[PDB]
Ligand SMILES: Nc1nc2c(ncn2[C@@H]2O[C@H](COP(=O)(O)OP(=O)(O)OP(=O)(O)O)[C@@H](O)[C@H]2O)c(=O)[nH]1
Ligand SMILES: Nc1nc2[nH]cnc2c(=O)[nH]1
């Protein structure tokens with residue numbers, strides 16, 4: 001909408017900037033603190049800044065919108081010694097193209113999105129059980145034996161009942177057929193019975209690529225040719241498999257587990273044998289549905305048969321697979337213990353398949369330069385419960401990140417606010433700019449501010465949001481984390497967290513950049529100082545902060561005293577950037593006078609809390 005970043009560059013970089021078309025903020029290591037706040041408030045776009053800033057802490061500098069561009073790895077601040085956000089490569093300085101440099105900032109800035117979202121997610125894992133609007137990324141960092149991960153991910157190409165296919169989507173190369181296999185099917189299994197594992201290259205490559213979850217799984221792997229593997233989570237069997245009894249002697253029943261059965265059995269003048277292998281893997285797993293949560297059975301399509309049967313839940317194509325590779329993978333969901341409730345995926349049952357259509361799947365989706373997104377989709381479809389955030393009622397604490405304000409949801413704001421009333425942490429796109437690579441809609445900021453602040457709920461903007469976890473949780477959100485304040489500021493974030501006692505005016509709360517510019521605009525376009533101050537911040541819709549906590553510091557706190565209030569700052573380990581009950585009631589009224597029905601309740605909710613408090 002308006003928020004910007006200060007694109008702070010270090011000395012060696014300065015001269016190039018000066019050729020740009022963006023503003024240039026020049027320091028000057030003095031500067032007092034209220035000097036920064038009034039200057040920084042002049043810039044409606046992003047800006048460049050250079051010159052000495054050794055006086056200020058990081059939290060301060062992030063409050064302002066600072067992103068650090070330098071050629072060297074870090075810059076000396078007052079707080080700590082920060083890792084430069086954007087490292088300019090030598091040969092890309094240097095050179096002194098103002099464009100190359102600008103495009104270089106952009107790219108990195110786009111990479112920084114993940115750090116912001118990680119920080120939030122990373123808190124949310126510490127503080128919640130349910131997760132909604134989830135996706136591969138959320139799955140990746142989850143404990144699947146603790147967290148419960150939901151959403152409505154975009155369903156892959158599938159065969160059953162059914163079929164429906166295509167339609168076709170753009171796609172890219174991935175890991176080889178058989179490492180890409182493990183990649184999507186290993187998420188919540190604790191014990192894998194891999195049948196026909198071969199030379200074990202497939203498994204070793206999985207180990208070298210995906211080391212965590214390889215280590216966290218027990219592998220009984222089965223093959224006459226299977227080589228010795230020292231690996232202690234890898235129990236090897238030189239047996240050849242023709243029945244369930246071959247696998248049963250290698251299972252603990254006195255102890256619960258999620259088991260996954262994987263069948264990849266091929267021999268060495270028709271091949272109606274390829275067939276009865278595929279079918280035997282099915283037949284074995286089916287006898288053992290009860291022990292296994294699921295199966296992933298090899299599925300080679302016959303030429304000889306025009307239509308045939310099998311026991312299946314799903315039949316899908318294989319990422320990383322060759323274009324001429326005429327082999328699908330069969331998924332059987334079974335009953336057996338699981339950490340993921342998979343009951344939405346039908347019980348494995350007899351399926352009549354039409355070759356020609358199975359034959360089509362391969363044609364459309366296979367390719368040794370295709371599969372990256374297919375693998376993803378398979379991963380989510382298999383392992384995320386298909387539940388709709390807004391409609392889901394939860395007995396356990398719930399996280400609601402980066403989905404709420406998707407276009408899919410438009411017109412359903414009520415259901416949204418409802419979520420942010422009782423979510424551990426959720427987020428709302430509030431950005432009003434052009435605004436690319438993202439397809440959410442914005443919630444008016446006032447309405448967010450006004451709707452979202454409950455006793456237990458701390459309504460902040462992304463950047464404030466972050467600053468707050470730094471301040472109260474130093475090791476969930478490090479000080480040194482790299483992120484993009486301007487982007488953080490495109491979100492409203494809400495956290496089930498108490499108001500600080502004593503409610504000190506820490507940066508996470510009080511920043512209000514360019515408020516003076518913001519106020520004069522109000523007045524040249526739609527006209528009508530702690531009163532005018534509260535009004536402005538609402539009318540502008542250019543800031544999300546936490547009404548409740550804010551109120552409580554204004555009255556219950558300032559004053560208090562020059563002396564006895566800093567003191568409670570010190571102490572609070574808090575910091576700031578800017579150095580009566582009736583003004584505010586007037587403020588609200590005025591605001592609601594200009595907008596009945598675009599709001600307000602609520603409003604009359606906050607008002608009846610002033611003349612009462
Ligand atoms: N399976 C299958 N293959 C087909 C079909 N139509 C053409 N083919 C070709 O026939 C070959 C598959 O039959 P086979 O000779 O038994 O080979 P395979 O068991 O699939 O495996 P490879 O030895 O790696 O080719 C491949 O080259 C396919 O491209 C079809 O409808 N189904
Ligand atoms: N900043 C940001 N981080 C993310 N991490 C995962 N998704 C997102 C997103 O949409 N934005």
Ligand SMILES: Nc1nc2[nH]cnc2c(=O)[nH]1
Nearest residue numbers: 136140183184375376379
């Ligand atoms: N199979 C698979 N696909 C993904 N897509 C994004 N992350 C992953 C992952 O860990 N496994």
